[PDB]
Amino acid sequence: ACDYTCGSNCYSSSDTSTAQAAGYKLHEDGETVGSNSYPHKYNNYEGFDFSVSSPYYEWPILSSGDVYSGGSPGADRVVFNENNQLAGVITHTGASGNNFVECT
Ligand SMILES: Nc1nc2c(ncn2[C@@H]2O[C@H](CO)[C@@H](O)[C@H]2OP(=O)(O)O)c(=O)[nH]1
Ligand SMILES: [Ca+2]
Ligand SMILES: [Ca+2]
Question: Are 88 and 50 in contact (CB under 8 A)?
């Protein structure tokens, strides 16, 4: 069973932890990868009800299980905060334009 489902993509907690660890490490070293400069601040324009505190940062989580290193980011993202806490897992899949909806 999936811990998180983003559209058709199935993710386990290990998947999200691995993705978060890579993005958080880049955040600490003050480095970014890709044309869209990940990881970067996530403003929560959508108004999701995150239980943990801000600031939030978004980082791509890939369906292949591979850690994002620069190319096409895909539709899925893990959102983490300054204390290395997972705020949520979101996706552009099933959402209009560049909006996001939460993975279930
Ligand atoms: N939809 C959305 N985009 C955000 C948010 N915070 C930052 N962004 C960025 O604001 C712009 C419009 O969506 C994009 O550059 C997007 O970055 P990403 O495209 O990298 O997600 C947010 O909370 N919601
Ligand atoms: Ca997996
Ligand atoms: Ca692989």
Answer: yes
All structural domains of the chain with their residue ranges: 1-104
d(CA 35, CA 37): 5
Give the method of determination: X-ray
Residue 28 Cα to ligand 3 middle (Å): 25
CA of 98, closest atom in ligand 1: 13
* Closest C-alpha to 78, from 59, 65, 63, 95: 59
Final resolution, Å: 1.9
Element of type H or E holding 30: none
Domain covering 1-104, topology? Nuclear Transport Factor 2; Chain: A, (3.10.450)
- Whole-Å CA distances, 87 to 18, 80, 95: 15, 5, 19
